[model samples]
Target chain A: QLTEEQIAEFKEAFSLFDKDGDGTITTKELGTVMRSLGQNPTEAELQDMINEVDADGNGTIDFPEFLTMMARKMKDTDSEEEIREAFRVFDKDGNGYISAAELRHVMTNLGEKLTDEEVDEMIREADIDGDGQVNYEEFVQMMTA
Target chain B: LGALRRRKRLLEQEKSLAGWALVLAGTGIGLMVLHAEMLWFGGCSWALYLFLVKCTISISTFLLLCLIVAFHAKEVQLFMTDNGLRDWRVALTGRQAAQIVLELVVCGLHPAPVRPGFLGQGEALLSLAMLLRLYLVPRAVLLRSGVLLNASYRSIGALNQVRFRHWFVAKLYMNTHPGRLLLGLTLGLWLTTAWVLSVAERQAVNATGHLSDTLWLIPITFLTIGYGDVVPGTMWGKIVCLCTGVMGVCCTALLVAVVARKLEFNKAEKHVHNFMMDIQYTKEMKESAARVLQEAWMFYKHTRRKESHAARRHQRKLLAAINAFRQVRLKHRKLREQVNSMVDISKMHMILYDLQQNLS
Candidate 1:
């Protein structure tokens, strides 16, 4: 259910880890990537990451696998209750709906500085029914999107 | 509707049983001929009585099986309606009879799809009913649950049942040892050739009025002995004999080659158990599974379109019943989880005591 842009980003991230370009982002390759981030991964940690990400049995992280792994990490970092509370804060007018303007405000608070055009794109992606304003469900989806 | 479906399925099963019985009877007859037995009536004095016994046993077994199958079919028909006599009468009438005939004709034209006599128009009708049930009923159940997202879940279950059956059978048969299959094929061919030669010899005896010569001719023609105890009089008969001799040798050679190739292929490929265990889902397989579920959902939606308001209301009621069942299942699952958690804590305490004892 990840968007094309999210899938592309995941593929790009996987390539960064797959230094050999042998179609396998092995545990060793993942360790190298982790070390570069000043996070020295143990063998077990590297194995866990590879197992979570490599789904196709070709020993590589495909786009869908990468997106799922990233999503899981994001969800673990913030509880569902916390995520909902943050979304509620962005609604501003207490209207149960968050407009593109409100979403921009929320994203800026999260340090995702975006242009007006980018905010519009985010709203378009999340408001699947073209309602212009995202409801609570749509707002939560947008954050994930 | 259920009774009618059962009746159709029973009838199809009867037809399958009958078809297999016929094949087994043919095989029995071939075996009798190979053994130089007079299995069938109206043969020469050279005919063996053991052949006749085998033939009788084969025919009787087939008849008994057919009767059992027919009895089941009758029972199903009776269960389908109180007016069972009327149903039977209708089946014998003009239009129904014509339809049956048409089905047979269609089967004859497309032997592969029909699978000869085992599956025909009657079985096809039963399968069609089953398909409709598979696609429509589950969707209605899902829709009633008030969760449109999970409505296709029941459809997925039905599709899995079908896919599992197909894959299991394929894996079983395709993975059979090549040597065994080759042996069966060789034996079958030899039996066929022997039967043909026996029939030819009987004909030759009838034409020439030479019993002793016919007895000698059997092994000579079969073994390509060419001892010249008896020679074929007609040019056509000689040509037939020559072709049979050459074909026997050629068939044996081809059989060996086919068996060798199968063995080689078996060695190269992984075993069925290994392959099944290692089955990785490709994107295509996932898409196909989704497509099947979608098709079932579509079929369910379409059936509702032509129904009356009352029927639609009844459908909704059925859906509600299904949802209630799902809720019960969820409640049971929660209770089971609590029990399991309690058990895990007990196990943990027991493990600590065991660790202390081991240290002591």
Candidate 2:
């Protein structure tokens, strides 16, 4: 279902997902990608995203399908546009950069309330370049990597 | 299994009682249409019949709702919580409860038109509005689908899954595969209006058309996009044209619903798909855990090398890994939520069922 090179390229991201070699990505498997990207999806949203990507209506993304989507996405030349769009959702006040305070406020209210320190820590982790905020490029790396 | 059985029993009783409630309400509406013509009487006889029919409906409507609440009080509680209320009983805040009761009394079992003559235009309009009571048929259908389509449960927390907040409309819609709601309601309403119109138009309509013609006009007028070749003679027949268009739309809507339901994915399919996804999530949880460990180790390795700048980068990467793991773990926690809520609901019902057995 994939080129040998394509297969080799995605082996790690996919292996890191479905460890049992079932060759499919379940919502939980998909979720690590989600949360590490800093999108803490709710139970309902989790189900919806799986449905969105699962074109065959099987409720999980099987390997070839995952390979197709991931390859297109990983190969994006203008991914910065998509990255900024994702960033804009969290930068609710229309500020260009995502601040620790905004992140703190958002993660605080989103479903399970984040404690102040917990929110602070989450922002700290995303602010890896030490700018005290997630700028566009940093935001892109945080989501994609 | 016993819990399901008891829940089934309560649900069946609830459905049975709902049927009775429908009968009472249907009879009340029937009496309303026919009452104008046949039952002009002294104050006492009028009051007696009014009280009889009114009580049958009011008590049954009230009783059916009470049983629904009894069976689904916790569901209502979750539904209440969904709306930010701590208790289900708040659905009847005193002002609303008082208002509902007062409104029912006003229309509950109406009195004979205080000044009776040929049915006035105003009277006809009020009767048409009262026909809105037929909307209750869909309500029973909603409760039935909630009980039957969804696995029955007792916990207050089950609302997260069951979603009663939307169930009133959503369940009614999803269960629109059946025709009885359309058949029973539209036919009864149209026929009742047909006969009433026959009586009504006979008085004012000239002999240019037969009594049966008015009857023909009601249905013909409804099913046909155009009015009958024969136009309505009086305001009564003209008003029945209003019924034709309105009730006709309700028919098409229900039929539209039936076809949509016919194409929908069935319950077994959704359940099987959900079960498979659940198994996959658990399997995925493991790989995610290893990821957390690996990321942590990366930070550890950088620290040991004394590359402090790189160590902080790994630290941030580790937290994101941690965030993903915990959220996936949150999914696992959701599995726990699902596993426990059902037991709590079913167990509570099971206890109530056995308690009934012991009490009996």
Candidate 3:
């Protein structure tokens, strides 16, 4: 959810482009703002951007809709989730440990054909206990770190 | 209310983890300082010093274990059921007991042989395994970051509108001022490391003769440049030299990055460079177009005269010029594309301009 201040700011930005005192921002209005900001987005791109934030079927962006769109755009984009997903691929037996064999299996599965030494290095980097395997905590550390 | 309670539960667990991690890190540092003090005094009071370090280390470790248990208690329960263990309670307690013992061994808190070392060999080895303590810093960072602390949530998809995490904060700071954070971290680490080394070395040096002689030794070793004029007399001094050398490499890497970034052009300069390059391409494009026109006109003249050799010559020249024009035209387009890609990154400062105000 966006802050009240941010919502107010978004409303102000929407009003700047609304020029005709309309609550809605049409493609023509956005086109004016985009050009002023040194961008020349195509009609199709404008349609897409409008559709993205357009809560109503009228094909125009209103103040609250505009605020919602901006808020959604500002969501978590970090890839910790991706790394956690990747960790699962290596934890073959679901024992929460990325064994050397498990790592090799996943690496080769990528079709890049990783070698023994490379697998060893991956394990070594993540294996904090030097147990020839990576635990859940170690795996998280390797990814984020 | 139910959702708030659920969020609070999660937040409290996470917050507890942060608190425990800090306490663990703090006590760890204190234990090290106490160890140094004991080393410094080197007498009957050392046992008490040893006792104090031992207690702090174990207590801090216990909290850290508690944090782990609190965090992963759910995961452990899931695992127990998933494994179909005869008694999940017994297995979980065993697991809990295992980490505590592990902590005791790793923190060097367990009873061991006192030697030229603390208890026996591998005194530091105990706490060194808490290299997991390194994770504490990142955890603390995450705990403090906007991602965790922006303290609100909602989403249509899986994405939650979180605030700044470690890398995000690091990146934001880096964008605002190149190398400040990296330089800050490196300098803090190096100086503290140096201070600790100095304290240890000076205590030993103060015992021997020269106090000031050890100062230059750090800079020298850190740079990996030995003058042979100075040498560390103790093993601690030698270890410090190695540590300094490694840290120097880290600092220089950060310094190199800062230099590379600072050398990068400002918005105006980047635009100017791109525009200048585009101008060069435009000049070549114009020359080639003119040459193509000239050759095509010559080909027409030769065709009207009906001379075989000249016509053939003109045709070849026309083709060559046409090809050159196309190539240069493509190059100009490429240049224009790059210039178009360039945009202002600097923060905009508002200049006075209001239509209503001006009209009034």
Candidate 4:
């Protein structure tokens, strides 16, 4: 179940898509919102999506329907345990910090081979302070942010 | 028994010493400058001026001792008690030893009481030599800086493999207050070079020997824009002028860096700009798609109506519209590609993980 804070955020996101303040999001507004979020859902897909979630069959999604969609999305999201497993793999040697060598090793081994300079840049991105390494909390925040 | 606590204590001791070192240096330089001015312009008794000069040298020597001790303490803190003797060795290594000797010789230098070449030669040489004592100013500032003083900062710095030394402290200040630091540096450099140039050239009978003339020449030489009107009369003046030129070049490069860094937008502004660009691209792509559809309909209408001539024109229009649509889509994809790299690998990997979860 989503927390009260999460539910409130969802309410806010729903209002963002409800362009006319009509308490419901039409398919056009849904298309714009999806595109803005970097998803390229075509008109037909958006209409079909609304149809699937429009329990009351009003041709648009109301707040409750959007909540239902959000609940389904939450189910599809990665669990904390799963995310930590990924963090562990990157934290090689279990040092609790991802340093340059660790990042370079992971990056080079994977198909995403990168230069040392670029790998350092990656560290710069996630390194909250000037430590040149990413801790567990910084990793988590970087993922969400 | 904690290492951090001990290190913090040493840092506090070093910080206080550095403050005193600065105080002694300023007092020494101030007294020497006052004595030199009085000697040149005939303001006070010769005996009093002699006493002041002797005290100035005493302060300078004490300040030197304070610096050597502070440097030793800095080494102990950096090594974290590896070896006391080893710390001393590194602290007094050739590079550092040379610097110490150089400061001592320069700050200890003064002209003999007997005037040579001119009445102000003694004052000129003494003033120039005593200015070297001001080197402790930055060291003192660094030692007492908030960044180095914070106990938690010391721990974090060690954990991150950083040394809280003069270089690190200077860099920290440079980054946070680049404009202010650079302004102070340039202004200090300009005034010092002007004074040195005037002192050097004033020993001769040359038009540029005047202080006002040297002040003008200082900036002109610094900017590498030689007007060729004012020229140095002595070797010392020429040397000072050349050094000023070199410093001017360095400051110019740094000024460019400071200006560029200042002009660059912050993270939030960058994000807002990219978001706006994305929104505009999306709107433009949709419009292009609509044009393609409209062209396709017109071409179809011409074909269906058996208007062969008009059908050819509409077919060309349809092709153009389709190409334009593809170009718009391609441009949007390129923009996303450029921006997507701004996200770090960890975040991207996490997103992929989420996608895999959804697929399952």
Candidate 5:
């Protein structure tokens, strides 16, 4: 049910991750990505994460694949109502756009336990346009990050 | 006498080989008929002519061999018996006898051992080779039975393993997938309808000056793709086309729905297989644990019923104690507070304490 635009973006992200162009994102690539994000996951842990995300057996996480994995995890940890509520909180000002304050409020409520500076680092990584605030696309990107 | 027996076996084998050759010829002729229109309509060009001529020669040779066998059956039988051949039919069962003779004569002509051991890796390889031969020459009943026998023996060999049972279930599940059945049926109907339409169109064109495109009309009307490429000129053809178009749409929808259901069922089946495997592993683990526990508790009981009762009581008490401890932990009190409220723990402790005291 993903829109064409969202699917295209997912394909772009998948290709970006698939460094070898072998149609598969190996454990090495996954580890590199994790290391760049300041988290050094072991090969086994990265393999488990990849297995959870790669839905189509294509060995790479497409857009829908990433969303499905994250959605399943969110559904397991928090109730559906809690997830819906989180989405609503992120979309502050009664508009669909997720501003910086909205993201901070939601992250704090979710027990992120990060310092203000660390939170700013996360926001900077998520917000593609250096705009201090995140829109819906940036909100999704931040969750994925 | 030994030479006469061998010759008899050789003649029996020769007769079987002739039978197999006839079947191969028949299958080749059937396949040729299947593509007859393509060959005839496309013209007997040089390449096609060469291929057809080669196949015809092979088929004719086999047919001539069959005729020769029929005419000289009595004479061949005498000659084989004179050369020390024995009737293998009397020595082995029907299928086995046929296969043995086939191996001795037909396949034996090649460099391989006859009477390969059943259920061995070599047998499996031979089974696969025989199956491929069957596919290529389906009329060879002896070869087909050989493949089936080897396959059955292999399955029987693996009967003791849990993987065998699971593999059997999965194979059966695949065969029963409704989507596959429906797709097969649809393709069969499509082929039959196309063949009938082709024949009818050919006949119509032969009778009338104009060509009737009844085949194209069915699909066009079904898809509502009115490209005006083909139209039904006759009343009966028009009526038949209308009926087919309506039925085709409904059938296509049903096919899609059945395929979707099949996909859903396949997912469910995979989950079931995983669940079954877990259950099997857990059951075996629990059984082993119970066996060890029973061995330790053997001195405490005389009869089987008494041992069973003791084990059940011990398991129940352990469960109850574990549940109570779990509840206390969930209360999230200090460790000392939790220890103070452990009434059942102290009761169980006292029982163990008294038992130990008595033993000393």
Candidate 6:
């Protein structure tokens, strides 16, 4: 049985990750949480994981499903894979680089539409070596920075 | 829908009745003042004077009845519709019942006419209670205001569990027309307080310090100036002045606050000012950075050439440039801090509202 503290911690994480705040975490929200944890997933993989934990097949992770997912995730401490997975979410389509367009699409999809200049500036900030695009190494360095 | 529409219509009629009540009350007070002035002169025909006095009493009675109906009509609407209470007795709570009874008694009061051997000419003292009839002013204003008439405002007020009472209307007007309301309030208070003080002092002090003297005393005391040229004589006058002083303090503080808020920058102004300052600071920072680089290069060149005099001079320039750059950087940091703290009412409301929605 989980202690009160453990349940509370899980609930906190669940709420924090529920960005749109509908009391349930959708695939987009799951991707956001995974990215924050230095890991990531595709829509299908996210849906698969959510369905596995989502006992009622609600297609979204409620508090109970969130608790189960958190428990499953708590055991893992994979570093390299986590970093590569985080990169994969942004890179999209197995691409090693995060283009300005891809970054804008993801950002606008999350919430709050940004101007093209802002999206370009974001990519430029992460592209440190002036290649006009962010590679995995550059992305990792940007993340740390 | 029809019931609500009828409620609105009844509410408007209630408002007009209250307005007429105010008009009648004012007329009665005016006549009383006129009749008293006529009596003091001692030349008017006895029958004509009596007729004027009788009319004043008649108007007062009519005003009292109108006010009662105006207020009770509101209770009728509420009981029949909002509360859905079948019996009229069930409509009023103890507090409301007490309020209604008190208002009725207060409004019904009028100074007994200055008859020869009847009330002994103390009408002015009793007339002070008649001023309480002005309590209807706020109710009348609330009823007649567009806020009550507008469906959107009414519906929203209902949805938010807000009562559109007299104080709510007062608050709405105060927020929208604060200066005008304050001006009206100050003038009314000055006149009413002066009249009350004059009456209270009339029995004690003779014509040496009359109504004009009381008027002079009122503002002096109200502003806490206390010129001491015209002071209150009686205990009643002293109490009035004491209350005047307390009111003066409160009004003065509020007036200063209202003026200060009016003069200060609003959110939009703050945003514009901050934006301009941020741009200025950014330009200064860039210029400072350029200066630092230029000074560093000059110092380096002089040092490499082994010119001691120029090297020392350039080194001093470099240090000054670096200090200037640091100052500019500090200014930029402070500006960013200001920007971060620029959250205003709308932003705060949005955040709290989102939180509320999420919690639900």
Against the native complex, each candidate's DockQ, computed on alpha carbons, is 0.01, 0.01, 0.03, 0.04, 0.01, 0.02
Clashing pairs in model 1? B39-B51, B39-B52
Tens-digit lDDT track for model 1 on B198-305? Answer: 333444325441344444454456557688756766543465567767766775687677767655433113233222322222222443445444544654675667
Error of 4 at B88 (Å): 12
Best of the two (4, 6) by TM-score: 6
Candidate 5 CAPRI-style tier: incorrect
Worst 10 residues of 6 chain B by lDDT: B113-122
Tens digits of per-residue lDDT, candidate 4, B107-193, equal: 565443442234354456665676766777777776666875667777887888977778877687777777776778788778767
lDDT of 4 by residue, A25-135 (tens): 888887765544445555688887788778999787888777766765667664654766788888768788887888788888787767888877778887877788788
Per-residue CA lDDT of candidate 2, range B180-271, in tens?
A: 65566667766666765665565434543434666677777687656548776687567767866876787788788777766866656855
- DockQ score of candidate 5? 0.01
lDDT: the better of candidates 2 and 5: 2
Q: List lDDT for all candidates, in order.
A: 0.51, 0.60, 0.61, 0.71, 0.49, 0.67
The regions of model 4 sitting more than 4 angstroms off are: A1-145, B1-14, B35-107, B111-117, B120-123, B146-151, B203-208, B265-271, B278-347, B355-360
Looking at candidate 2 chain B, the ten consecutive residues that score lowest on lDDT are B150-159
TM-score of each: 0.27, 0.37, 0.47, 0.55, 0.25, 0.56
Off by over 4 Å in 3: A1-25, A28-40, A52-56, A62-145, B1-20, B45-49, B68-119, B127-132, B142-165, B175-187, B195-215, B232-243, B253-360
Residue-pair clash count for candidate 6: 0
Best by TM-score: 6
User: What CAPRI grade goes to candidate 1?
Assistant: incorrect
- What ranges in model 1 sit over 4 Å off? A1-145, B4-175, B202-360
- lDDT ranking from best candidate downward: 4, 6, 3, 2, 1, 5
Q: Which candidate, 1 or 6, would have the higher DockQ against the true structure? A: 6
lDDT of 3 by residue, B93-167 (tens): 666767656644444343222433222235444433444455456656665554442322222112222345578
Instruction: State in Å the error of residue A51, model 1.
Output: 14
Candidate 5 lDDT (Cα, whole model)? 0.49
Deviation of model 4 at B19, angstroms:
2.4
Where does model 5 exceed 4 Å of error?
A1-145, B1-147, B151-193, B203-261, B265-360
